[PDB]
Design a protein around this ligand. Structure first.
Ligand code: BCL
Ligand code: BCL
Ligand code: BCL
Ligand code: BCL
Ligand code: BCL
Ligand code: BPH
Ligand code: MQ8
Ligand code: CRT
Ligand code: CRT
Ligand code: CRT
Ligand code: CRT
Ligand code: CA
Ligand code: CA
Ligand code: CA
Ligand code: CA
Ligand code: CA
Ligand code: FE
Lengths: 60, 319, 258, 280, 40, 60, 60, 40, 60, 40, 60, 60, 40
């Protein structure tokens, strides 16, 4: 909260328009890339465990 | 300097043109323009300045990581022996992760560095695409370049994103190697029954060929008409001129029909951009949808028939 | 592509998906290919094609709108252009046959020498100054450090005889380069512009060879209105005059070789 | 039938051979000497190509003889005859037909020549087209000649001439290691990289954002100067392209030529000269 | 350049606060990390 | 922030906006990188060991 | 302090913009080219010796 | 170049103290690692 | 710098800026180049003998 | 060129000296080098 | 040395700055080249032999 | 300087500046090419025989 | 070209001479070589 009183000026040197939409994307990919990384390897919340029935009673 | 509008006989120079005024938010161009008599004897001599903003800097830095990683491992296998490095350069290359890892993050040793240097090269392009989009609208320009570059990127990702992942194995991915990657395309074909019969692969060639064809015509024609100012396409697209005024008649009389100075560039676009379009597809289908394009062809009565002057037995069924 | 199908699969369900897009894109193009020229003029040889048609496979597109830059008009594509003029007579009453140029074909303004009436205005740069101008105005432009200077060289001619000497060359602000050469004809002592495309160099004898027209033809070359800037109208009518030479500068040229 | 601005260009003259005689326009095309020539080869060959589909590998009654555009094929005679004319049936067709190809391609160029001769334009197009023809003169004449057999040519079969490309290719193992072949490839790619770039820019300056004027060469230069720094130039590209295009074919011509007459071993191996260098 | 000592100096502190802000935000990242799974 | 005193002079010669973007980007990669170079080696926390195998209690 | 005597005159022919920028780059890449290559080397720290394999313990 | 003697010597000085800032922070760096994992 | 006295003359034709910067680079690369080259075959303190034990011993 | 005889020596002397500082710096490097692991 | 009695005339046709910078490189390259080629097969003092075998002595 | 009487005329058609530097490039390349072709086959004095396997024999 | 008969002679002399300087240098090595492994 200390430097909070002195950072608003960040808007006198960095144009908003560009910094906004730019990040809007920045995150779009990022997150769209997280589910990505996690899903392929970490865990597969859809096919890993439950509900076990969908493909246990499905693939059969 | 033979003048068939091949090499600029006499060059002239003016104060370094620092590009046109950009909009608000776009950092000022950087780099003191340079002059090259030789280079300029081919076309333009002035050099730079170049733009470099967030996306730009974020890109030039990003992909520069992948390259390092690659070149690193390459010089690594050669046991950091540059001597044998510059010797086996063509051969040297960063191999992908072994099938004994599927898509899971492998150790830097068995395929790790590849993946890393891969994502850094994947985004490096995706990011660079935006970098171009920012250079178009900043000049009120359209996004024909992004659209194309996109198409190319499409096929680029087909070699890793959409296909390999759709196969469940980082093994089906091209490696970071001048020669070894030639083997990739060499093996891929072998693995999938000969891409000569793969429909899309053919359609794509029609472009790798058509492309070369058109520019051979256009690039030429414009020159042949460069006399009547046929190079200044812009003012020709706006108000038709004598250059474009005979430039078409030629083709028309030669092949029957023709298109306009602008029009053509549109064909070229679709004849080139559609190249990779039929690329990522032909590969997106291979491995997943089809596995043997030879039998696939004959399956649809495509594969031609040849007499049998040579044939071999089959020890399998026999034994 | 077979007439009858007995096999179905995904691979083929996407192929046709392309051809449709293709057969469509080829049309999209064709449409655009008609934004300059059509409709046709006569019927010498009834439009040839697998399927005749009135004006091609695809109906003419809708007029596009081109906003030239500042201090400029507006262009439409396509556009209804008024009929031109032909300064030549039919070599034969049979359609297709060529049209013989009347008078001196070197200036009959037909075919090789024939040029459309381009806008009687002048092209400009981004800011607004005439794009192409003479070095006598381009205070910044200088000959590339090393490359021989053209200003001062004697412009020779087809027949070989000298036609005049260069008094200046026209550079291009927009695109750094030499596009024209302010030639000073000897005969008429006038000042005509010479296009790079036809301008050849012989740095050895300080000349600007030209196989286009004879040295004598350099005399009656389409003069320019303002010596401080070349009009698009004239500009195109300029280098076009030289073209005539490419096919009129000598009876032998137009004449067969075998 | 002529274009809004055609009439004023249809000038008489600029013919190479017997021009005045055939000096005229048939529809949107031109004839002249070479005009009739090519045609005399077209039907004389195009039909023969059909006669092949009709006849077939062995006979018209055979089960092989098909009409499927894909399976259609016109293979050359055996390597036995070498430089001899084989029975029209056993390779003859191909041989003859091919002779019609050169008569069509070459004449087509020659025809373009004087055609340009009339428009007083540059002879770039034809000269450029030459390479294409030249490349052909290599895959049927040059190569086969130094190989001593017109049978070394490629079959005239939509898909048939692909196998001829697969075998001859593997005939040198991994045909991807060919120096000239690689080089050439690069060009084909560069070229496409050029088109996707050139055509795009034009449309991006003559049809900008909504409510925007037609940009000028002033932008074009800056555009590519802000993404990668330098801008080759207006006609420069039209030069560069033409270059790539031709270079792509040239280096290719070399690519196949060297394969066989100038090298029998496996291309992958050729690179050994670089290895066996007294430096490593 | 393109600035004087005045406007400059100010920037130096303002950003400096946010700079260390990182050294701190990331120091808490590690210190709590080393705590979890000690490395080396 | 002690040395901050003399360090202030840097702003007079180099464009502040540059060192900011160059770094805001430089950290971008470094971060995406570290979790990567690390997750690929020391501990692939996501799906290499702890916690309760998404494969064992998962696949079954 | 010794050499620092006449070494000041250096900036009189070599622009500071140059050094400052290149220096950062070199020291950046150079540095990364150390943990990197050295990492790949025996004294690896992420997954070499200790922390003793817990993955094996915790995982299963 | 682009400067005179005055501005020149001033830069060099501060520029040095900043360089010894590194060597020291890096040498102390090496040493800390040198103690932990001995190379050679 | 003994006989180097007469050499003073070299500066007028060997541009100062260029000579310094360029040369400064040649070493940068070489310095690494060498270290890399020696590090390759001769002896690799990084992966040869001790005090490295944690690498091999710590691994298994 | 662009310079004259007078500063020709000055730049000459300042640069020559430093060069020998490294030659002594590195010669010494190769010294402790030989001390540690002798080569050839 | 005599044979050079008239050799002075060389600095009149050739460009000193060029002939200098050129050789500057030629020997620069000729040199790194040789060490390279000799060090390859002839005597590879690096991994070829003694004094000591930090690797064959220390490794094993 | 025997033939220096009648052959002097050579320099009037042959641009002295070109042939001099041009020939220079040649010989040095021819030289580097020869050593190359010879050292490789005829006898690779560097690697081929004696003085002796100081390296292989001397080491192991 | 770019000269006359007189001046041309001057160059021919200095050039020619120093040339043998090379053949003289070459032969001696060819022979110092032929002394060693007299090829063939
Ligand atoms: C270059 C190395 C090989 C070769 C390798 C390949 C490979 C590899 C491929 C082709 C492909 C093609 N080749 Mg091939 N081809 C060779 C030599 C030829 C020759 C020749 C005269 O020498 C011809 C006419 C063709 C023709 C063709 C087309 C049928 C097909 C489309 C290519 C393309 O789009 O180009 C760009 C140009 C255009 C689209 C415009 C014009 C081309 C038209 C569409 C083709 C008409 C050919 C026609 C059937 C011939 C008879 C005409 C009669 C009048 C009916 N090839 C040589 C021997 N060729 C592709 C294919 O799909 O084959 C099935 C493919 O993948
Ligand atoms: C196992 C197979 C091998 C292989 C074996 C071969 C062999 C064997 C050959 C090639 C050849 C070529 N290969 Mg390869 N090649 C392989 C893999 C590849 C790959 C790849 C990505 O994997 C690529 C990009 C290429 C690329 C190429 C081209 C560089 C080259 C064709 C050149 C050319 O421009 O001809 C240009 C064009 C022509 C010769 C045809 C002439 C055109 C005529 C004049 C016009 C026809 C008009 C027509 C009649 C009218 C149509 C209109 C209708 C009336 C409607 N190869 C694999 C590894 N390749 C060929 C080559 O090198 O040629 C030089 C060749 O012989
Ligand atoms: C490796 C072992 C640990 C671990 C250890 C660490 C450590 C150690 C750190 C992180 C850090 C991060 N981790 Mg963690 N992390 C783990 C697992 C994860 C997982 C996961 C799915 O398993 C995820 C999703 C994350 C996610 C993240 C990110 C939130 C964060 C990256 C910060 C960064 O560098 O930005 C890049 C930087 C920038 C874009 C710019 C710099 C920021 C500046 C100060 C603000 C911008 C100022 C600007 C000019 C003003 C305008 C503002 C707007 C632009 C308008 N971690 C495992 C369990 N993680 C870092 C962190 O968040 O520290 C707080 C960190 O230091
Ligand atoms: C192989 C056996 C030894 C070993 C033996 C050696 C030997 C032997 C040497 C080195 C040297 C070096 N080693 Mg060691 N080294 C080992 C292991 C390592 C490891 C490691 C991780 O294991 C590392 C990171 C290093 C790192 C280094 C570098 C610090 C240093 C190369 C400096 C240089 O290139 O200047 C390049 C030069 C320049 C950029 C410019 C020229 C310098 C001038 C005089 C100053 C600049 C003037 C300028 C114009 C003024 C403006 C100032 C600024 C430029 C703005 N070594 C092993 C243990 N190492 C070299 C060294 O220390 O030299 C002192 C050396 O000779
Ligand atoms: C093969 C068995 C022998 C052997 C046999 C031979 C033989 C036999 C010959 C050589 C020759 C040479 N050998 Mg040996 N050589 C061996 C092993 C080696 C090894 C090695 C690492 O093992 C090396 C590095 C060399 C190196 C060399 C070169 C010094 C020399 C070729 C020079 C040259 O091409 O100039 C290229 C030329 C030029 C640049 C210019 C032409 C010269 C003119 C006259 C001077 C320039 C004039 C100019 C206009 C004036 C301006 C002056 C400055 C340029 C500014 N040899 C083994 C031991 N070597 C050649 C030689 O030295 O002849 C004397 C030769 O004939
Ligand atoms: C380096 C040269 C590049 C190039 C340039 C180029 N091509 C050109 C031109 C130019 C400059 C033209 O001017 C000309 C053109 O289109 O003019 C309007 C053309 C052209 N390039 C063409 C095709 C083509 N170019 C190719 C390549 C290239 N063209 C290169 C990239 C390719 C391939 C294989 O990639 C093809 C397929 C044509 C569309 C056209 C030339 C048309 C022509 O002149 O046809 C003459 C003949 C006939 C219409 C009748 C043929 C019938 C014969 C009696 C039988 C011949 C049999 C044949 C050999 C069998 C083929 C069977 C295959 C299906 C297997
Ligand atoms: C099985 C079944 C039912 C069958 C039915 C069969 C039936 C009905 C048959 C009857 C129909 C028949 C017989 C049709 C015959 C049609 C024939 C023979 C056409 C011959 C013409 C011919 C061979 C054309 C070749 C055209 C080709 C392949 C061109 C390749 C390049 C290409 C993409 C061109 C298109 C774009 C164009 C026109 C580019 C040329 C062009 C270029 C290159 C410029 O640079 C330029 C610069 C400035 C202004 C204009 C131009 C310009 O027009
Ligand atoms: C009138 O206007 C006035 C003057 C008042 C000004 C108003 C100003 C305002 C609002 C200004 C604001 C400025 C701001 C907010 C600036 C903020 C700046 C910040 C937060 C800067 C932070 C900087 C952080 C830095 C430089 C961190 C550097 C980190 C480094 C160099 C890390 C190196 C890491 C390495 C080498 C990692 C290597 C990884 C391995 C080891 C794996 O590589 C092999
Ligand atoms: C007061 O004066 C003022 C200040 C006004 C002006 C100027 C003062 C100047 C300009 C002072 C300049 C001083 C200079 C210029 C000193 C320069 C000395 C130089 C440049 C000496 C260079 C000599 C280079 C030589 C002799 C190179 C010879 C190379 C040979 C023979 C190489 C042979 C290589 C072979 C055979 C390689 C074979 C390769 C392998 C071995 C691989 O083949 C198998
Ligand atoms: C008012 O005017 C004022 C006072 C401002 C004027 C200002 C004057 C100034 C600022 C003057 C400053 C002058 C300076 C600082 C001069 C600096 C000179 C330096 C630092 C020179 C450094 C030289 C380093 C050298 C020469 C290293 C040379 C290494 C060589 C040539 C190595 C060759 C290596 C080979 C051939 C290696 C081969 C390796 C193998 C062959 C084994 O690879 C396979
Ligand atoms: C030591 O090096 C120095 C410092 C001297 C610099 C020198 C560097 C050099 C010489 C580098 C040379 C590099 C070369 C020659 C590279 C050649 C590369 C080639 C020929 C590549 C060919 C093909 C590459 C392809 C097709 C790559 C495709 C990559 C893909 C599709 C990557 C996809 C990555 C994905 C989808 C990542 C997703 C993120 C995760 C894995 C988390 O999603 C689950
Ligand atoms: Ca492989
Ligand atoms: Ca550890
Ligand atoms: Ca050790
Ligand atoms: Ca040794
Ligand atoms: Ca012998
Ligand atoms: Fe164009």
């Amino acid at each position: 909260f200390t430097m909070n009183a002195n950072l608003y000026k960040i808007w006198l040197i960095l144009d908003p328009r560009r910094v906004l939409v730019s990040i809007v994307a920045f995150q779009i990919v990022l997150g769209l890339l997280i589910h990505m990384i996690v899903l392929s390897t970490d865990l597969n919340w859809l096919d890993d465990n439950i509900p076990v029935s969908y493909q246990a009673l499905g693939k059969k | 300097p033979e003048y068939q509008n091949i090499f600029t006989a006499v060059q002239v120079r003016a104060p370094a043109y620092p590009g046109v005024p950009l909009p608000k938010g776009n950092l000022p161009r950087i780099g003191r323009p340079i002059f090259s008599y030789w280079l300029g004897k081919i076309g333009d001599a002035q050099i730079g300045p170049i733009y470099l903003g967030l996306t730009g800097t974020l890109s030039i830095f990003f992909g520069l990581v992948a390259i390092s990683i690659i070149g690193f491992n390459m010089l690594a296998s050669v046991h950091w022996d540059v001597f044998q490095f510059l010797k086996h350069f063509f051969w040297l290359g960063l191999e992908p992760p072994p099938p004994q890892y599927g898509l899971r993050i492998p150790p830097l040793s068995e395929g790790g560095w590849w993946l890393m240097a891969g994502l850094f090269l994947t985004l490096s392009i995706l990011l660079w695409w935006v970098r171009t989009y920012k250079r178009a609208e900043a000049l009120g320009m359209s996004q024909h370049l992004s659209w194309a570059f996109a198409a190319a990127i499409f096929f680029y990702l087909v070699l890793g994103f959409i296909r390999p992942v759709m196969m469940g194995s980082w093994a089906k991915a091209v490696p970071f190697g001048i020669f070894p990657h030639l083997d990739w395309t060499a093996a891929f074909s072998i693995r999938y029954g000969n891409l000569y019969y793969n429909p899309f692969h053919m359609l794509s060639i029609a472009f790798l060929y058509g492309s070369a064809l058109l520019f051979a015509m256009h690039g030429a024609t414009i020159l042949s008409v460069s006399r009547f100012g046929g190079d200044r396409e812009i003012d020709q697209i706006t108000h038709r001129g004598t250059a474009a005024e005979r430039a078409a008649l030629f083709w028309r009389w030669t092949m029957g029909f023709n298109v306009t100075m602008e029009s053509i560039h549109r064909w070229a676009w679709w004849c080139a951009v559609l190249t990779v379009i039929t690329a990522g597809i032909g590969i997106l289908l291979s491995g997943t949808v089809v596995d043997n394009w030879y039998l696939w062809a004959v399956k649809h009565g495509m594969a031609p028939a040849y007499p049998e002057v040579v044939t071999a037995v089959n020890p399998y069924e026999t034994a | 592509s077979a007439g009858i199908t007995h096999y179905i699969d995904a691979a083929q369900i996407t192929i046709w998906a392309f051809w449709l897009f293709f057969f469509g894109l080829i049309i999209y193009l064709r449409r655009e290919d008609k934004r300059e020229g059509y409709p046709l003029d006569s019927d010498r040889t009834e439009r040839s094609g697998g399927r005749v048609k009135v004006v091609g496979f695809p109906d003419l597109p809708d007029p596009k709108t081109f906003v030239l830059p500042h201090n400029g008009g507006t262009v439409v594509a396509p556009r209804v252009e008024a009929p031109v003029a032909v300064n030549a007579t039919p070599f034969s009453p049979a359609p297709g046959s060529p049209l013989v140029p009347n008078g001196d074909p070197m200036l009959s303004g037909f075919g090789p020498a024939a040029s459309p009436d381009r806008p009687k205005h002048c092209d400009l740069t981004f800011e607004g100054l005439p794009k192409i101008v003479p070095m006598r105005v381009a205070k910044e432009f200088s000959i590339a450090e090393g490359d021989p200077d053209p200003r001062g060289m004697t412009v020779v001619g087809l027949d070989g005889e000298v036609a005049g000497t260069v008094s200046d060359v026209w550079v291009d602000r927009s695109e750094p380069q030499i596009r024209y050469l302010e030639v000073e004809v000897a005969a008429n002592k006038k000042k005509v512009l010479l296009p790079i495309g036809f301008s050849r160099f012989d740095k050895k004898a300080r000349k600007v060879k030209v196989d286009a027209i004879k040295a004598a033809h350099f005399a009656n070359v389409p003069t320019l209105s303002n010596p401080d800037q070349v009009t698009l109208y004239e500009e195109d009518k300029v280098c076009a005059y030289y073209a005539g030479g490419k096919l009129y500068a000598t009876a032998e040229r137009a004449g067969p070789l075998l | 039938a002529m274009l809004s601005f055609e009439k004023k260009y249809r000038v008489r003259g600029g013919t190479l051979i017997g021009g005045d005689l055939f000096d005229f326009w048939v529809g949107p095309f031109y004839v002249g000497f070479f005009g009739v020539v090519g045609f005399c080869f077209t039907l004389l060959g195009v039909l023969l190509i059909v006669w092949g589909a009709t006849i077939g590998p062995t006979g018209p009654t055979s089960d092989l003889q098909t009409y499927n555009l894909w399976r259609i094929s016109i293979a050359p005679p055996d390597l036995s005859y070498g430089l001899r004319m084989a029975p029209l049936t056993e390779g003859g067709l191909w041989q003859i037909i091919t002779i019609c190809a050169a008569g069509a391609f070459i004449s087509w160029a020659l025809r373009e020549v004087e055609i340009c001769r009339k428009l007083g334009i540059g002879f770039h197009v034809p000269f450029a087209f030459s390479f294409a023809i030249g490349a052909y003169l290599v895959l049927v004449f040059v190569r086969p000649l130094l190989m001593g057999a017109w049978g070394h040519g490629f079959p005239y079969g939509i898909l048939s001439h692909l196998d001829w490309v697969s075998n001859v290719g593997y005939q040198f193992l991994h045909f991807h290691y060919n120096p000239a072949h690689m080089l050439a490839i690069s060009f084909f790619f560069t070229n496409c990289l050029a088109l996707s770039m050139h055509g795009s820019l034009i449309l991006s300056v003559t049809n900008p954002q909504k409510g925007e004027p037609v940009k000028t060469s002033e932008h074009e230069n800056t555009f590519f100067r802000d993404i990668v720094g330098y801008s080759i130039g207006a006609l420069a590209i039209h030069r560069l392209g033409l270059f790539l295009a031709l270079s792509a074919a040239f280096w290719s011509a070399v690519c196949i030529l060297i394969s066989g007459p100038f090298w029998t071993r496996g291309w992958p191996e050729w690179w050994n000269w670089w290895l066996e260098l007294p430096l490593w | 350049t393109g600035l004087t000592d005045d406007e400059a100096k100010e920037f130096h502190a303002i950003f400096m606060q946010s700079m260390y802000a990182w050294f701190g935000l990331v120091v808490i990242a590690h210190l709590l990390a080393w705590l979890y799974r000690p490395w080396l």
